[PDB]
RNA sequence: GAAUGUAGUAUGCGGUCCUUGCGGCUGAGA
């Protein structure tokens, strides 16, 4: 029923704080984190909303290109709809019902829920990097076989989708075990004359292979081209260290920023009885992809630019490549933003 | 919360509850007092074929000096507990 | 803790003497507990006769026993007036009509805990540090040397007896000379007229009390 | 040995602490709101430094020398100051839990097989550092969660 | 987000930006992020201090709008006649915040679910960090890192505002330096050797002059001609660049170390445990922060704020070479800084 | 898709008591709301708590198949050995949506039918 | 299985501050000056250099630079109390930036070849910027313990 | 016997307030 998938690289650039609401702990406000993991990840429904939200501005504001022309809602209503548009659009006037396009993609509004259903089906960011301070170096991006397997795993999904054959064969040589004291990490952490690195609070015996971070390397570049979200990616190279499993594990669970927010009696200059809180947020520069499955248009009488799946890919990537959202909601104290780079696979 | 509490710390824990959710203390103790007056009636299914506590329930007597007597006070306790909010939970969406 | 055994108020960028709005602050609050003790220092045991008690059974169990020594003077007058401030600052609104005269005006205790603040309420006055003026840096020394010369050490530390003997070892730390002008600042928050208020009783404590190290050697001392 | 039960063992402990310090030192409020204060404070200090940094945190604030690193031969009412004492109390009632659960009868009877927490830290491997803090955290919630229902500042 | 304004906090006295989630050597921290290390003051600190000012302001009548000044008490009258009173006394009582402040900050934590505030104040990254050296007394530091995280910073306010000739300003910025290394101004390399000194090291210097010329023009750009109170031009050649190790191993060490007491009057001396150490950010540091301005989401809106555009310049007429406090110590005059309302 | 020995090291086969504890509460519940761009917050009323079961869960179900009715079928769908080959050759290794959260990423399955 | 940096940092201030207080439990003076020389030596440390303070607790020591061996160092040879309190603190710091909690421990030691004083004198600023974070840090735990069990004056 | 769709845990909130790096020491001995 999916025809094509476009992959979703997102970079934070400030902290992220995607809200759990459903959690029995008084702590702290934790970020949703796969249960039976404990990885940071970021769920559809969240993810979709922002995605839906800022396309629907998009199409109101008349910014989206379609087939390198711009895009008028407004006109393409009279053409798809004639009689009763002036009715139709009265309502997303009023807020009742969202534009064309955004109906057409991420589905209908809530009132019309029941005339059909979106083109797209937003999935899960996971993660991909982590960052974690590091003695040598600024900090560095960590990953593990788990999160390589996810990926792999990832593109099978993909290649099943489109039926190809080369996209199972990216990873295929991806054979990548480490021991609980052992690291694969690049020349910019690696201790002088020692072969060690200490992420965070752990010394770990570096690993002599090259082969696993080039592959890996490459594969991002396959996905979201040469620039890293701003900087060359072999900029990046030589700061990306494999470590455990079990080691990786514990860095996603502890080393996510904890802030100890608070709010002050104006009257009496201090902090106010009861009022203290603290949140945990994701830590900026962490790599996370989603993957986005995008089938036929459901609902018909629609305009030939946006006739097949292929048409609707190119709106999607064209509206969001290289482009900066807010996921999660800290946004008036700056919190969420992060960089997004789509891109199909070979 | 209702599976893993005891009549020890039930009032403790539904002042607690009832001052952080609440928008004042008054209307906390009012919560407080109407939660714990109501949920002492409130029938119970036990495993056994135990209908004494529901005949002590049904009345208002010395069933809660019966239930230290009793065997099986913290099933009672937290089956009591979980039927009131469920009944509560059906009054808010009835009129909700 | 330097590595010379001592050391200096030097600022990071330009390596100029300073005095830091905290010893300002700190200084002024205890020119303010002084001149209470001394102006009404029984009226207020008599007033708080249960915390000076409590002072000195706390003075009692940490210098070995002395029971019921206490001695009941300007000492225990003064540390009872820094307790009520800093831990029992709601018992002073009895103590708010008192005033005491500073200079040629006279303040209120509650005016100076207004200005000092408490634990629940933040201070109404804001210290600036103080800055030697860099016009006089050219012509007069900003930075000088100072002697200390401690003979009978050993008496004073391993407690040998006094004497012709222990020959004394002397260091030496950096000052800023007399003479050095510096530029004093303090800004209110709800009445300019505290901010009036804390200035007096600032240039006050500056002309009597002093302020840095060596207060009672006459060290830190200032004039109009 | 389910998650309820745990859960339940948790309650039950966290009370009986909580009402044990509310009714020892009823009198002095000073006393209460520094140890609810401290408790709301502790399992933050534990994710961002760690179980063992924030113990010997703890171990730092008891004005007094130590034999040896060891949570039974604390005694908190001995120190004079409500801070000492708090963190003398947390500090105790943090590490029995670690050490012995809710006593050996109760199904939970602790990690650290009735060793000081501090020392479980000091030579166990870091998974066990990771558990034990998962469960100090855990324990902390609960206790903050009746400190605050009961303790009055 | 319609519009952008970025806002330049340049110490004059050290700030302390409290953290107090942690404990460490030297006590009492700064907020700071965990994976990098670099000194940040966080959007939440940031934004209650300019809304504590602003609410002064408006309840003193000192904001200028349009330049003219704003008469709350009618304004909230005039659009909100039905509760003109009501609200009035909700502020009077401190219960609720004034009518300017709900509309630009948002609401008071009394109305939290009546909308949404119309301001993002983003975190305040490090931009310059003084350092001591031999000649030169202190120079300001930067690093590849955060002139990269500043060049994301114009790609954000450039798809903000649709414009792209501010997204090539810095674009032209791409340099390598190993930890020896540096690129500095004249006033610090040493007279007759290619070495500086900077507070503990001695970096080899490597000549590339477009580099700092292009950051010059950039902070020229950013925050006028007044580089807050002293020509750029005279600064330009005390900027020098470091690498990225160097850089974060400065901002770990060379952060101001204070020791405060506590003096007992019964003794004269320090009290028992009063002492304690307080770390704060150096003296003529340079921090930046984006200050985006949306949709403002209140109800029958004023004339004179209805747009995301009528914001902006209030905002900037308003928060334009001011003095504020961030972080603590306030009474002991710490934590002050002068701040720049620059448009890019 | 994964190897079979990297799987044989990550079973615990735990008491029933324990393994139905689990399965009610180690699932993800998941807390949703619905946001309305008039205001910005949230709307009345639009909270509720939908639960998930864990990913990583290998489900198995029982196909029972019988020969087909006889109304003039193809030459290839005559008996049962026929009508099951089709069936499996076509779900097998395939990715198939179930329950009602298709949009936000929530189904997608992969099928082994056993050969 | 792997070991937390931080375990073996606590492990390390544990045994020298219990080392102390065990062979000096008569000498009051010398358990108080060594508390007051540990928590003042990391102030040292950030004011002045790690390298300075290394050599400042050998001025007190009498003992020469350059001939600086801390495995060749007695510091119970000294008579006077500060003398070996600063013997102590030198031997336990230039241990740890040396040797780390032991080779078979998870922190085998920055320098691992040669005594810390000499790692300062001759190796880039980046290697001593590592090794003043590992010295504050050992600091930090070694005046925890010592806050905590020793005899303070 | 056969025969879901639509949905951002978000909105508002300053790690603040109170704390003198103080205490003691002959540039002197012939």
Same mark, same amino acid.
């Given at each position: 029923?999916?025809?094509?998938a476009?992959?979703?690289?997102?970079?934070?650039?400030?902290?992220?704080?995607?809200?759990?609401?459903?959690?029995?702990?008084?702590?702290?406000?934790?970020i949703?984190?796969?249960?039976?993991?404990?990885?940071?990840?970021?769920?559809?429904?969240?993810?979709?909303?922002?995605?839906?939200?800022?396309?629907?501005?998009?199409?109101?504001?008349?910014?989206?290109?379609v087939?390198?022309?711009?895009?008028k809602?407004?006109?393409?209503?009279?053409?798809?709809?004639?009689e009763?548009?002036?009715?139709?659009?009265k309502?997303?006037?009023?807020?009742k019902?969202?534009?064309?396009?955004?109906?057409?993609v991420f589905?209908?509004?809530?009132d019309?829920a029941?005339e059909?259903a979106?083109?797209?089906?937003v999935?899960?960011?996971?993660?991909?990097?982590?960052?974690?301070?590091?003695?040598?170096?600024?900090?560095?991006?960590?990953?593990?076989?788990?999160?390589?397997?996810?990926?792999?795993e990832?593109?099978?999904?993909?290649?099943?989708?489109?039926?190809?054959?080369?996209?199972?064969?990216?990873?295929?040589?991806?054979?990548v075990?480490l021991?609980?004291?052992?690291?694969?990490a690049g020349?910019?952490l690696?201790?002088?004359?020692?072969?060690?690195?200490?992420?965070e609070?752990?010394?770990?015996?570096?690993?002599?292979?090259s082969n696993?971070?080039?592959?890996?390397v490459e594969?991002?570049?396959?996905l979201?081209?040469?620039?890293?979200?701003?900087?060359?990616?072999?900029?990046?190279?030589?700061?990306?260290?494999?470590?455990?499993?079990?080691?990786?594990?514990?860095?996603?669970?502890?080393?996510?920023?904890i802030?100890?927010?608070?709010?002050?009696?104006?009257?009496?200059?201090?902090?106010?009885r009861?009022?203290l809180?603290?949140?945990?947020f994701l830590?900026?520069?962490?790599?996370?992809?989603?993957?986005?499955?995008?089938?036929?248009?459901?609902?018909?009488?629609?305009?030939?630019?946006?006739?097949?799946?292929?048409?609707?890919?190119?709106?999607?990537?064209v509206?969001?490549?290289?482009?900066?959202?807010?996921?999660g909601?800290?946004?008036?104290?700056?919190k969420?933003?992060?960089?997004?780079?789509?891109?199909?696979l070979? | 919360?209702?599976?893993?509490?005891?009549?020890?710390?039930?009032?403790?824990?539904?002042?607690?509850?009832?001052?952080?959710?609440?928008?004042?203390?008054?209307?906390?103790?009012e919560?407080?007092?109407?939660?714990?007056?109501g949920?002492?009636?409130?029938?119970?299914?036990?495993e056994?074929?135990?209908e004494?506590?529901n005949?002590?329930?049904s009345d208002?007597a010395n069933?809660?000096?019966?239930?230290?007597?009793?065997?099986?006070?913290?099933?009672?306790?937290?089956?009591?507990?979980?039927?009131?909010?469920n009944?509560?939970?059906?009054?808010?969406?009835?009129?909700? | 803790?330097?590595?010379?055994?001592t050391?200096?108020?030097?600022?990071?960028?330009?390596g100029?003497?300073?005095?830091?709005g905290?010893?300002?602050?700190?200084?002024?609050?205890?020119?303010?507990?002084?001149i209470?003790a001394?102006?009404?220092?029984?009226?207020?045991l008599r007033?708080?006769?249960?915390?000076?008690?409590?002072?000195?059974?706390?003075?009692?169990?940490?210098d070995?026993?002395?029971?019921?020594?206490?001695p009941?003077?300007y000492?225990?007058?003064?540390?009872?007036?820094?307790?009520?401030?800093?831990?029992?600052?709601?018992?002073?609104?009895?103590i708010?009509?008192?005033?005491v005269?500073?200079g040629?005006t006279?303040i209120?205790?509650?005016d100076?805990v207004?200005?000092?603040?408490?634990?629940?309420?933040?201070?109404?006055?804001?210290f600036?540090?103080?800055?030697p003026?860099?016009?006089?840096?050219?012509?007069?020394?900003?930075?000088?040397?100072?002697?200390?010369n401690?003979?009978?050490?050993?008496?004073?530390?391993?407690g040998?007896?006094?004497?012709?003997?222990?020959?004394?070892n002397?260091?030496?730390?950096?000052?800023?000379?007399?003479?050095?002008?510096?530029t004093?600042?303090?800004?209110?928050?709800?009445?300019d007229?505290?901010?009036?208020?804390?200035?007096?009783?600032?240039?006050?404590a500056?002309?009597?009390?002093?302020?840095?190290?060596?207060?009672?050697?006459?060290?830190?001392?200032?004039?109009? | 040995?389910? $998650?309820?039960?745990?859960?339940?063992?948790? +309650?039950?402990? *966290? !009370?009986?602490?909580?009402?044990?310090? @509310?009714?020892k030192?009823?009198?002095?409020?000073?006393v209460?709101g520094?140890?609810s204060?401290?408790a709301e404070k502790?399992?933050? $200090?534990?994710?961002?430094?760690?179980?063992g +940094?924030?113990? *010997? !945190?703890?171990?730092?604030?008891?004005? @007094?020398?130590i034999?040896?690193?060891?949570?039974?031969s604390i005694?908190?009412e001995?120190?004079?100051?409500a801070?000492?004492?708090?963190?003398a109390?947390?500090?105790?009632?943090?590490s029995?839990?670690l050490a012995?659960?809710?006593?050996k009868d109760?199904a939970?009877?602790?990690?650290?097989?009735?060793?000081?927490?501090?020392?479980?830290?000091?030579?166990?491997?870091?998974?066990?550092?990771?558990?034990s803090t998962?469960?100090?955290?855990?324990?902390?919630?609960?206790?903050?969660?009746?400190?605050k229902?009961?303790?009055?500042?």
């Open positions: 029923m999916f025809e094509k476009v992959v979703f690289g997102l970079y934070s650039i400030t902290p992220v704080h995607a809200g759990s609401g459903a959690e029995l702990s008084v702590i702290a406000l934790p949703q984190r796969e249960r039976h993991t404990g990885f940071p990840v970021i769920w559809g429904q969240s993810l979709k909303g922002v995605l839906r939200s800022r396309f629907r501005q998009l199409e109101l504001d008349e910014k989206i290109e087939e390198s022309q711009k895009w809602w407004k006109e393409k209503t009279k053409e798809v709809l004639k009763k548009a002036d009715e139709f659009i309502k997303v006037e009023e807020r019902r969202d534009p064309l396009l955004t109906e057409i589905g209908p509004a809530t019309g029941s059909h979106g083109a797209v089906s999935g899960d960011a996971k993660i991909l990097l982590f960052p974690v301070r590091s003695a040598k170096g600024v900090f560095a991006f960590v990953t593990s076989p788990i999160v390589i397997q996810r990926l792999k990832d593109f099978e999904l993909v290649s099943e989708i489109e039926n190809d054959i080369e996209l199972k064969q990216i990873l295929s040589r991806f054979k075990e021991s609980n004291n052992e690291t694969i020349n910019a690696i201790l002088n004359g020692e072969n060690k690195v200490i992420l609070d752990i010394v770990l015996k570096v690993k002599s292979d696993v971070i080039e592959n890996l594969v991002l570049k396959t979201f081209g040469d620039n890293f979200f701003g900087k060359p990616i072999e900029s990046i190279k030589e700061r990306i260290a494999i470590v455990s499993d079990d080691v990786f594990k514990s860095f996603t669970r502890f080393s996510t920023e802030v100890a927010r608070v709010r002050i009696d104006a009257e009496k200059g201090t902090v106010a009861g009022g809180w603290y949140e945990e830590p900026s520069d962490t790599l996370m992809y989603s993957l986005i499955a995008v089938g036929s248009p459901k609902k018909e009488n629609l305009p030939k630019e946006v006739d097949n799946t292929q048409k609707i890919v190119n709106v999607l990537k509206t969001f490549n290289n482009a900066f959202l807010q996921i909601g800290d946004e008036t104290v700056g969420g933003f992060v960089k997004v780079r789509a891109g199909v070979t | 919360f209702a599976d893993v509490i005891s009549k020890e710390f039930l009032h403790q824990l539904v002042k607690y509850e009832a001052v952080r959710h609440s928008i004042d203390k008054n209307l906390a103790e919560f407080q007092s109407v939660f714990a007056r949920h002492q009636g409130v029938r119970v299914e036990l056994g074929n135990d004494e506590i005949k002590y329930i208002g069933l809660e000096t019966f239930l230290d007597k009793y065997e099986k006070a913290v099933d009672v306790i937290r089956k009591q507990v979980r039927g009131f909010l009944l509560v939970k059906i009054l808010y969406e009835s009129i909700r | 803790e330097s590595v010379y055994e050391s200096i108020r030097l600022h990071r960028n330009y100029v003497p300073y005095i830091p905290s010893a300002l602050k700190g200084v002024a609050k205890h020119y303010a507990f002084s209470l001394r102006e009404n220092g029984d009226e207020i007033i708080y006769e249960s915390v000076k008690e409590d002072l000195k059974a706390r003075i009692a169990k940490r070995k026993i002395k029971k019921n020594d206490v009941e003077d000492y225990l007058t003064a540390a009872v007036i820094q307790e009520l401030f800093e831990k029992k600052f709601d018992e002073l609104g009895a708010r009509n008192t005033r005269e500073i040629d006279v209120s205790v509650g100076i207004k200005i000092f603040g408490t634990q629940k309420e933040e201070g109404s006055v804001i600036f540090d103080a800055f003026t860099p016009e006089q840096l050219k012509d007069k020394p900003n930075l000088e040397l100072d002697i200390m401690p003979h009978y050490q050993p008496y004073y530390q391993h040998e007896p006094p004497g012709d003997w222990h020959s004394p002397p260091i030496f730390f950096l000052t800023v000379p007399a003479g050095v002008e510096f004093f600042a303090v800004a209110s928050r709800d009445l007229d505290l901010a009036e208020k804390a200035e007096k009783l600032l240039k006050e500056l002309k009597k009390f002093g302020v840095g190290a060596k207060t009672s050697l006459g060290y830190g001392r200032f004039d109009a | 040995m389910d $998650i309820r039960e745990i859960e339940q063992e948790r +309650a039950s402990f *966290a !009370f009986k602490v909580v009402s044990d310090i @509310k009714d030192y009823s009198q002095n409020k000073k209460q520094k140890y204060s401290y502790a399992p933050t $200090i534990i994710l961002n430094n760690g179980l +940094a924030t113990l *010997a !945190f703890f171990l730092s604030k008891l004005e @007094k020398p034999d040896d690193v060891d949570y039974k005694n908190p001995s120190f004079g100051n801070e000492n004492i708090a963190y109390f947390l500090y105790k009632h943090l029995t839990w012995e659960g809710n006593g109760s939970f009877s602790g990690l650290t097989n009735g060793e000081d927490p501090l020392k479980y830290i000091m030579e166990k491997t870091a998974i066990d550092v990771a558990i998962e469960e100090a955290l855990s324990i902390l919630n609960w206790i903050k969660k009746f400190a229902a009961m303790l009055e500042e």
